């Protein structure tokens, strides 16, 4: 019983993000996780970020209390600059600079994460993995849902989800999902707002043809907090021995952040006969973003402010409890088009059944940037001596003062105007030959990644075309009792947008991974358990120039090797459980400035476990009680490994009551509380001047009704 029970467990056994063909998870020679709509509806995650919380190999709350982006550090790696490596419907949501798009989980059918190299099917990519969200689609049966949310910090949400067939044979059906949300962010003076509508339409002329129109529109007046805090006053105590309170805000009173998303496309598939099927995926999007932001830049005594006049103008002991600040003014617009066409050839060679995949992937991205950035001494200073049992106890924090984002002094600030172009075209081939219990996957892909940046201010143009090749091979020995052992080799590549000492675009970095493991996907039991160990290596990483030159040099190499185990299974008819453990060994293997160091923000040990319980007996029938905990190990807060952010464990709880016992079947009411013990933690730090307070205990009531 209960939607998220074995019904989800099993549905989650299938996926395509691993092989670009509908394969059962144990037949995929690579690490992959799946979270369902029922699952997401139970936990009510703020973003896809949380939705993946009980998955191994993923730091998902790195930025802490911020929700602006959906950045994930998978297996200790991320894309250059920390740009999202997020996919939607098999097509990438390409972004640039501060222009990345996000998707509300209320518009998703499910989310999936694939670990390690994946270029063999998607082209240029961060060695570590990629997230792939699936848009909600028109349903077979009717759906009339309205949802109401009320929570802390003045969180108020209201949305709907409607799906129906236009004819009685289902050849014509739609779906319309929309939500309105507004709330105050953890940090004083920050707000969050969002309006999203997803129009979808399906067309099934017959039973071997499907064309579904997928669109999304989202408007966000205010994005929320995305600032930086010094390790001094967060991880470590201030000279006065106190700390900045979790709701502290160091930006202007007039800081502003907005994102605009518009996209249309479709998912198509046609089964010609018994040996041929073809599917194409296309999407076009125009997204915009803007901000007027004052961010922190460490305390005056931080090396980063060695050249700060305002900073030196203070007594040597004050430099340690004064915060330096810089700013930015950004305006961006980008259009992104994508099409992936694939032909599936099903056949065999006597006991050698084949599944030949061959297709072409294409994409182009254009992002126009017009920003302005304040450097040293471009904005005031803040005397962090404001912890006190006042701003902690009483109104945790006092908003700061305004700030002139106009009249940009040529002395302390400057303009930034860039136009980036990106184009990628790849062709791939992959066969899945199963020889009765001996499934073997082997494929390849050739990519054409071409980039071109125009510096409107310098009147300069940097360009580079790359030509790469990646292949993957693996074998799964599917037993018949459940236990499915596997292993595989995999490659990945990622072009560089950086320019070197010579004035050229660095060569692409590459991903090399060896992984072995076993998967338990028994068919007679609603349970699934996995475990794997891997050795993933990225090469030609950009490192400091051997002789300090302001420019970087390639050659750097990093290695990440670890163990991941995931487990999901129904223990009774009312008790479900989910959990995983992650052991990550990330290390600098070749770097001028570092070496033997572990990159920042990546803990060595990671773990999480969750379980729920529903009643089908007494007056407490239909009552669901669930709870879980997420543990984050210690991590370094900078490449230099000069200090360390400590480990933490947050607990979440929910009480759901199946309102069906009042006649309203399919409707229910829930209460969710995050960080129950309202712990206080520093999520992570990317450096000494870039740390983030974790999320402070939240409480949300959710009334969802089905007609
Ligand atoms: C490869 O280096 C990347 C590391 C990422 O990771 C993080 C977590 O680590 C750092 C930062 C990160 O975000 C920094 C950061 O953000 C700073 N500002 C950037 C601009 O806006 C305000 C904040 C920042 C730093 O000093 C930062 C810093 O020291 C560290 C270690 N500003 C300044 O000193 C000031 C006062 C002005 C600079 C102006 C120009 C415009 C920039 O020089 C630009 C040409 C380019 O150099 C960067 C954008 C570069 O980006 C790319 O090359 C690809 O672009 C992206 O992917 C950008 C992007 C970053 N994030 C986190 C999210 C989305 C997009 C970053 C440095
Ligand atoms: C009909 C589906 C195939 C779409 C092919 C898209 C063509 C993109 C142009 C390729 N190239 C970059 C080499 O000019
Ligand atoms: Mg090349
Ligand atoms: Na295989």
UniProtKB/Swiss-Prot annotation:
Side Extracellular, residues: 151-155, 181-194, 218-261, 285-336, 363-424, 447-468, 492-511, 535-561, 583-605, 631-649, 675-697
Keyword Ion transport: yes
Key word Isomerase present: no
Motif (TonB C-terminal box): 690-707
Residue positions binding ferrichrome: 63, 82, 97-98, 226-228, 295-297, 373, 695
Transmembrane segments: 142-150, 156-164, 172-180, 195-204, 209-217, 262-270, 276-284, 337-345, 354-362, 425-433, 438-446, 469-477, 483-491, 512-520, 526-534, 562-570, 574-582, 606-614, 622-630, 650-658, 666-674, 698-706
Record-marked site positions (Interaction with phage T5 RBP-pb5): 526
Periplasmic compartment residues: 1-141, 165-171, 205-208, 271-275, 346-353, 434-437, 478-482, 521-525, 571-573, 615-621, 659-665, 707
Domain TBDR plug: 24-136
A GO molecular function held by the record: siderophore uptake transmembrane transporter activity
Membrane topology category: Multi-pass membrane protein
Domain TBDR beta-barrel: 141-707
Subcellular location: Cell outer membrane
Protein induction: Induced 1.6-fold by hydroxyurea.
GO terms (BP aspect): intracellular iron ion homeostasis; siderophore transmembrane transport; siderophore-dependent iron import into cell
The organism's place on the tree of life at top rank: Bacteria
Keywords recorded for this protein, A-Z: Cell outer membrane, Disulfide bond, Ion transport, Iron, Iron transport, Membrane, Receptor, Signal, TonB box, Transmembrane, Transmembrane beta strand, Transport
Family annotation (SUPFAM superfamilies): Porins (SSF56935)
InterPro entries attached to this UniProt entry: Plug_dom, Plug_dom_sf, TonB-dep_rcpt-like, TonB-dep_rcpt_b-brl, TonB_box_CS, TonB_rcpt_b-brl_sf, TonB_rcpt_CS, TonB_sidphr_rcpt
Predominant place of localization: membrane
An example Gene Ontology CC term for this record: membrane
Family statement drawn from the similarity comment of this UniProt entry: Belongs to the TonB-dependent receptor family.
Summary of subunit composition and partner proteins: Monomer. Interacts with TonB. Interacts with Escherichia phage T5 receptor-binding protein pb5 (RBP-pb5); this interaction is necessary for the entry of the viral genome into the host cell.
Function: Involved in the uptake of iron in complex with ferrichrome, a hydroxamate-type siderophore. Binds and transports ferrichrome-iron across the outer membrane. In addition to its role in ferrichrome-iron transport, transports the antibiotic albomycin, which is a structural analog of ferrichrome, and acts as a receptor for colicin M, microcin J25 and bacteriophages T1, T5, phi80 and UC-1. The energy source, which is required for all FhuA functions except infection by phage T5, is provided by the inner membrane TonB system.
Record-given protein name: Ferrichrome outer membrane transporter/phage receptor
Gene name of this polypeptide: fhuA
